[PDB]
Amino acid sequence: RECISIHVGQAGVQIGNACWELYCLEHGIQPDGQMPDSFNTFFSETGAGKHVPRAVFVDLEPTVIDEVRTGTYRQLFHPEQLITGKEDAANNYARGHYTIGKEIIDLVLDRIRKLADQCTGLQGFLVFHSFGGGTGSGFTSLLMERLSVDYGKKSKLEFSIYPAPQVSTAVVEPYNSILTTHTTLEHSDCAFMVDNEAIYDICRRNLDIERPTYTNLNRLIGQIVSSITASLRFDGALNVDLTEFQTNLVPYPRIHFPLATYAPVISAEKAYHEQLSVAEITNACFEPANQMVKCDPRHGKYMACCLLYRGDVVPKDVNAAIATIKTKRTIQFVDWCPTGFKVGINYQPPTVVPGGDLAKVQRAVCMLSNTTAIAEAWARLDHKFDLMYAKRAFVHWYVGEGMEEGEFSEAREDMAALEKDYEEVGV
Amino acid sequence: RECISIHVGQAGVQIGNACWELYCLEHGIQPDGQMPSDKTIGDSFNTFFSETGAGKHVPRAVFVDLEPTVIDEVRTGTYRQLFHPEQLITGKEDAANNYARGHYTIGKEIIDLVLDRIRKLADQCTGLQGFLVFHSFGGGTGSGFTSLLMERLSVDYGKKSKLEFSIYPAPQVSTAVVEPYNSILTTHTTLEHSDCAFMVDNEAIYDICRRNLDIERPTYTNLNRLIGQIVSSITASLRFDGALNVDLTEFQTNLVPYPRIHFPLATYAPVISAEQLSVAEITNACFEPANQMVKCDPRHGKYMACCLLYRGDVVPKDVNAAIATIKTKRTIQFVDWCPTGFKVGINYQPPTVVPGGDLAKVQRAVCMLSNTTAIAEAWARLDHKFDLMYAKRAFVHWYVGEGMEEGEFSEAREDMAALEKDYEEVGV
Amino acid sequence: REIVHIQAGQCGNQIGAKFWEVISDEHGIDPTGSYHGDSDLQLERINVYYNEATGNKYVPRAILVDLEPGTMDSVRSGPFGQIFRPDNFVFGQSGAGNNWAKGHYTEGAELVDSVLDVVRKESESCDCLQGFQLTHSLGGGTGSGMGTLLISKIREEYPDRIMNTFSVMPSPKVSDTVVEPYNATLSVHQLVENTDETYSIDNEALYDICFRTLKLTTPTYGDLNHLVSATMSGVTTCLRFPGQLNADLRKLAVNMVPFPRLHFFMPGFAPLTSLTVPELTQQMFDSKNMMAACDPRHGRYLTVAAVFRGRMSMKEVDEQMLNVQNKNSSYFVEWIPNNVKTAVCDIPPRGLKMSATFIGNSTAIQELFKRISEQFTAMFRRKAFLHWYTGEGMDEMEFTEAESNMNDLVSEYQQYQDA
Amino acid sequence: REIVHIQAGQCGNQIGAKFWEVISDEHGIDPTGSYHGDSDLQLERINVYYNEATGNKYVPRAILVDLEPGTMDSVRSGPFGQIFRPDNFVFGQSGAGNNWAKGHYTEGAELVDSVLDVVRKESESCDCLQGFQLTHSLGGGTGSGMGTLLISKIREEYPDRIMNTFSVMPSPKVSDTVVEPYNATLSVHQLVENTDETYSIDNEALYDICFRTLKLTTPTYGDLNHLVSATMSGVTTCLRFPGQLNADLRKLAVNMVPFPRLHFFMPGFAPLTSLTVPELTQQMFDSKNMMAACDPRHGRYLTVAAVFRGRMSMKEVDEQMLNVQNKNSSYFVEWIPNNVKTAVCDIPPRGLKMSATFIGNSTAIQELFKRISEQFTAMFRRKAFLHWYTGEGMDEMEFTEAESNMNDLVSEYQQYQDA
Amino acid sequence: ADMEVIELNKCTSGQSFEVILKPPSFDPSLEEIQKKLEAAEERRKYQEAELLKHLAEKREHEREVIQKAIEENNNFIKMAKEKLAQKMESNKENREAHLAAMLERLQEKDKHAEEVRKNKELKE
Ligand SMILES: Nc1nc2c(ncn2[C@@H]2O[C@H](COP(=O)(O)OP(=O)(O)OP(=O)(O)O)[C@@H](O)[C@H]2O)c(=O)[nH]1
Ligand SMILES: Nc1nc2c(ncn2[C@@H]2O[C@H](COP(=O)(O)OP(=O)(O)OP(=O)(O)O)[C@@H](O)[C@H]2O)c(=O)[nH]1
Ligand SMILES: Nc1nc2c(ncn2[C@@H]2O[C@H](COP(=O)(O)OP(=O)(O)O)[C@@H](O)[C@H]2O)c(=O)[nH]1
Ligand SMILES: Nc1nc2c(ncn2[C@@H]2O[C@H](COP(=O)(O)OP(=O)(O)O)[C@@H](O)[C@H]2O)c(=O)[nH]1
Ligand SMILES: COc1ccc(S(=O)(=O)Nc2cccnc2Nc2ccc(O)cc2)cc1
């Protein structure tokens, strides 16, 4: 039925801010809230005029939440849905989870419930957050534990922002990542990683943006997320509701992390070429360059696959298109599982943000896959970690806010487990 | 902040008289107290003078002697107007060339009055710093009364440093045969109530006046003028406020490394007779036993802290390249455990000399204060005299006479023995 | 989110009076008056360094401490003299002594309170106080002595908030008190325990930057102050301008220091006196161009933050930064991953079209400490001038007890050249 | 700072009357009247020897004691007779006897008081009284007998102030009383105990200086008095003129005497009768030119003060003084360091362009004592003239008790020719 | 490679359908513990509430050092006070009695002239 968004952490928030924006344009809601069931999946019809999102925004500094109740959209949300916490998280899990987090959690968890309160059958939670970085790791963690308590079945879908050398804040990033991901993993249902690097790569090859902004990268994530939620905002076949999300991607409660791949990304300026063919964009979904977590699944296997199309498309091609992706390409399916390709078409042609960077398309595809090679990210992370912790590099700051030396051991010890879990699915 | 002078003893006094004079000409104060030079109100040269009444400029000084004679000369010839009639104390009967007398017998009496008058001066000082005690080493009240003073000053004034300017007695220009006794007698009581102590070998000064000044057989008031200068160059630091040496702890924090070893070695720069010298040359003059100021030789003993105090027209740009070459063609000589010194103090104030004096006006003069271990040459050259009189109780009885003890003579020498050992025991 | 400033002791106060008028120019402040400039950014982060009073006006959050009038009237009768709040000055009257003990125990603690008493009223006024920063000499007492004390009283009141200092570690040329080793060592100890970051500005470097590379013959305390003031501007920028990161000074600490004891940064600057990007990068990573007297050669970099100034495309700043982590790939510890971060602010300093500044947690720093502790143990030897402290009521062994503690910190930076 | 004068006994009085008028001339005093002279210095130290009365006038601080009229009317009817204050004269009436005992016990103590009664006035008039000096014969009673007593009464009244005497030790040629040895010895004893300095003027020398070197045939008590007067002038000068030292007479004593008992000076003079610097120096240090009969050969100098008169450059006086401590280097005890001091006064005596005078603590003096005690024990032998004293109430053994005491002082000077 | 495709869901504005292509071919989070996130706060306290009681130390050392300066200073003054007039009231006592033992050495050769003067009052 319904569907609450939570966005925690400066990244979490901006990603949100810029995909809510895209929900709006897609649903022809003017910033004031008024538009002149269905899309009710995400918004509540409040008062008589308005259209408020079912969303909460949390951050432990004002700064970023302040920018939202500044520039239009200022009108969209409700003053109470945006929570802000005066003192920072300061780039560590410890602080967010235990010290500066302990305080604000009771208020956030309350406000969420205020939103749950006007929902005759609320479905789940879409938690957006930064992987490394202060409150994104720490407070998100504390959230999911608690949400897991106040909300029994009720799925949780996380959209993590896997941190990248080139566009990063913090040195201690690896620690927080491996820290959270550990607490966080058994309270979540399916989890969409987003490699910042990956996205910054796309913006350099495909979008031509010399040195891309956050709000550059963000618009792009916007799109992919909008393409994944599409299913339940409009309503149409396959991933019609949140449970179907795990049913189709996660055959093993632990292995959450599917691999996303947006279809045609091209810069307005190109906005008038000849359009791209149902065939070609499918055959784009298979390409490390068009990926979304820098890895390579030609070497690792696949264990469930999902072509999520948007636009003007009759299946009779999608078929003959899949068909030939098989015959001149990398099949690669695991041991004990049909060969997937659950295929969702939504007729809703993709709109993009008006003065944006991309052009308006006729047809876009989305490809969600549960590959076993997504665990490339899982070590590329660890190795950093391993090699700091091997000298208690920054450890002390954590013991400082009052954590335990042993938590650090026993969190990594879970990634060790996972990494084994994963590659042990090979076939 | 402030700074009181005390001059006890015929020498003490005349030395004073003749560097106060020099302070005056250096600060453009007419004998008649008044200065049309900048003015005042009641800073800068305030360190040493109090702006009394509305016109005048009195020194912060007391002059004590146990005979009139010498103090009477001061309230006789101009400058007569400078001081205040109270600041000059005189005691009717003499010291008679013995510590015993000065300290116990004829001193006992006057000390209360002097110590009072001092306080009067200290009374108009919002933060008085210390005392500059000028006195004779041998000689009657200079040894004995000076001693008794310092003990008492040490009691009425807690921290408050004391800086003594002693006149180490010389065969050729001397009064008394019993000199050695007094010297070693005082120096003993005196040494643990003082902070840093500038010795002045009379011989040395008389020597300078013969090589450099050309005065066939030099006067007291000949020598005195020369002392004046050196003292004036040492006090200089805190009378205008100049770059380095800026207060009384900090100035000496520099020099004395150990509660005992007070005695630095002074060396005035260019001394030449009326009727220019290079920054380089005068530096390299500060290293020469002939230009010294306590007849010794520190090429043989070591050095434990060194201080170049320049005065006049000088950019450090040279002072540097000058020190530099003093190290490459000469006697380095620095002790085991102490950087290699050369705290360098420049005052831009060009040196003025006494008008119808003996010396000429200079463009640049240096001062060099050093704590060498060889200054203990004086410490024995004295003792040996002492040792060899006392070895027959030579004049002893005169002291037991005014009421001293045989044992004090033992136990005072027993302290120079100690010191002499202290000193030479600082060698690498 | 809002920081106070203590500026104690002549060297320190002289540093700060330059500091204050350079940063005051960046923003645009008259002697008192508020804004006069065609720029706009300025006053977004003026919050951070300027508590503001009625009418126009801007007045810096500034505490000035000294143990003698002298150096204060020197500010009030000079540059931006009129600007600091009247009873934001804390007079000494007493002596200062150039003697740590005086400054830390007697003649100093003496005062302390009337200082804390002012810091209390700026800090409990500050809407969300980040932390304090302090500037001062390390040899010579009023600054190093009271200062180290100040902070030991600041922590305790404010454990809480973070603790920043530019302390100027001193040298045997361009100095005066035979004693400075003693003073500094005593403070070095104190700092190591009670600060969260300390920028090590070496006067030995500072002087060398003037005469080895500047044609500057007889360097004042003036020209040479000029460097520190410039380095402080460059260092602060991200606290007080843009909206790039937003730099918590806390954020800075937690990211810059792996190990609690080793919060010692050598700074370094771009152009100098009283520029291209490439020529700017290896000029800021040149040894002969650091703010401390070491050579970031013997000793690798733990972590380094760097900050560039002036509208120029950073697409090249990346391309060059990333270069010196290969043209020097060896000299950055491999056990901390991406341990160089850089940021860009596009509003130049007083003069100059293009600048850049370097913050450096290098174990090259060991070089500096080692060299003071080596004229220190060379002095505490036959127990030298110590009787100046002995006598003020300090302990014989407290000296060896700091030696020992510092001597550690040497052999910990040594300890981190590992694998 | 101010001294009194006792002048007792014929030989004593006669010495003094000459003394007084030579020194009275130096200053310039009429018979009574004050000043008449183109010199100016003079009256700075006239204080010392001249208590002054109303009007002009100057009158010497003088007490004149005798045990017969005779020698007093000799002054009052002679030289500067008019000058001494009227009841400053103490008449005897009685016999004098040329017998120590009379003068010290009976016919002398008899008077004593009326003398003390005058010294008390002058002394308790003196603004700061230095001490007394006394002139007198040693053999013959009125001077030696009462005199020794006088001083033994002066001390006790005045222990306090110092005690000076020119006593004329007598000889077997130019004398009269077979007895003098007796008288002298008895006094010698007395002096050794009760004076601080005694100038030993030998008549034996005095007579010798006239006939051995002058061609003076039949020497009066006159010519021969002349020497003493001249010698006393020379000796006193520095007490009564310049502003060189200032000479405390106390200062003199403490400096001149190592050992309390040995206060015996032989004096000596420059030119003589009724001069170059060199020829002045070895003439003053010549034996044949001492005021006592010894030879400053057998016996070294303990300490020596010397004094030169008349404007001439002392750059030469040093050069020569310093010479005879090498040309005679042997004969100054090495155990007292710089044991010769000399001073210069630039205003000549009566007549004479250039003078000089010698004060001498020599153990050569032993020679003198020894020679009297040798005609004493040669007489006390079979107890000769003793019955003149026995009978006046004196003791048999008091004589041997003085012998013994003197005989010591001999063997103490001997004792000091040491190492 | 040539399909056969099942087909779930025809929708308002959408269509789904799987396409199995080659046969498959083979064979407790509950609450209690926020009593964790206070036992972490009972460290951030024990760690702070000690580097507090540790400045409690490095304070009342000031006490100690400011006080052993004065403790040792009046120690000097009120030792060197009586280092005087107890070595000066042994001095006025010294001479005075040495003065008197000269007067008693002089009254004794004065009570001696008295005993031979009235001994003249014995000779006939
Ligand atoms: N994609 C994307 N990543 C971001 C964005 N902002 C920060 N990040 C990344 O998120 C991580 C830092 O997380 P933050 O959200 O800034 O940390 P936080 O504690 O959650 O937020 P603060 O309260 O500002 O400290 C780094 O990996 C950054 O690369 C953003 O706007 N978009
Ligand atoms: N440099 C210098 N030394 C002097 C002077 N006058 C005396 N002396 C020396 O000082 C010592 C004597 O000290 P005095 O001051 O004369 O003795 P005093 O008792 O203190 O003073 P008086 O009361 O006059 O006896 C000897 O070493 C002399 O050489 C002088 O004017 N200048
Ligand atoms: N760069 C800088 N350092 C200084 C300055 N003044 C003094 N110093 C250094 O600091 C030390 C003494 O500092 P000072 O201010 O005199 O100490 P305080 O006044 O007692 O706090 C000396 O060793 C100098 O090298 C200054 O003007 N600028
Ligand atoms: N030089 C000096 N000595 C004299 C004079 N008259 C006597 N004497 C000596 O002093 C001794 C006697 O002194 P005198 O005056 O008769 O003793 P008094 O009169 O009883 O005190 C004789 O032995 C003489 O040698 C005198 O004229 N001048
Ligand atoms: C190299 O490791 C890091 C990473 C991030 C940081 S930061 O988020 O705290 N900000 C920052 C990055 C680069 C340069 N300067 C920064 N801030 C800053 C803040 C205050 C200063 O005085 C200096 C620099 C600091 C160090």
Ligand SMILES: COc1ccc(S(=O)(=O)Nc2cccnc2Nc2ccc(O)cc2)cc1
């Ligand atoms: C040789 O030892 C000394 C040193 C100094 C002195 S002095 O300071 O007392 N004056 C003095 C020096 C040289 C010659 N005569 C002196 N005074 C003096 C005073 C009274 C006299 O009847 C004779 C000499 C005396 C003896």
Ligand SMILES: [Mg+2]
């Ligand atoms: Mg200073």
